Amino acid sequence: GVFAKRTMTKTRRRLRDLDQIERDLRSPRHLQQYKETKAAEDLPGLGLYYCIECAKWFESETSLVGHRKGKPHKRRLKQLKEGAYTHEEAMAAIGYRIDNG
């Protein structure tokens, strides 16, 4: 189930993008940036229990190990195995390159 599915596509209901998840997994600095863009006291579990794969905070470690079995987590793992879509792939689709001398 999706909560309030009618307004799911609004800009104020936007979620983190998969290429951002790729950059967070590759480099910790972007993930840290996404951490100070939030307030630690209002996060579920005070921000200690966070799944980078699903970009989601959880109230407890048992809840985290709980969602890791779920098919949303496995779909996120599958999507990250196939790889996110980027501007480099967009240029390679049309055969475009960047000339830097």
């Binding site: 006291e41 209002d42 579920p44």
Partner: protein, 64 residues
């Protein structure tokens, strides 16, 4: 007094009012969407209990 608040809410270990209201919200279950504490509602409860004679407080009389 601090110990009066401790026996009133069965809570201890806060360094400031924000932490006190956060631990009180997490203990009493006053949570918003996502488990975020209801600090506003907990503060309203504390103020109402303070006025309605549920937390012990008084002003000492000036000595002669």
């Amino acid at each position: 007094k601090q110990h009066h608040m401790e026996r009133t809410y069965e809570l201890r270990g806060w360094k400031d009012h924000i932490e006190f209201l956060e631990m009180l919200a997490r203990k009493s279950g006053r949570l918003l969407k996502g488990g975020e504490p209801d600090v506003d509602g907990v503060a309203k409860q504390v103020l109402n209990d303070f006025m309605r004679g549920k937390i012990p407080w008084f002003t000492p009389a000036p000595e002669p």
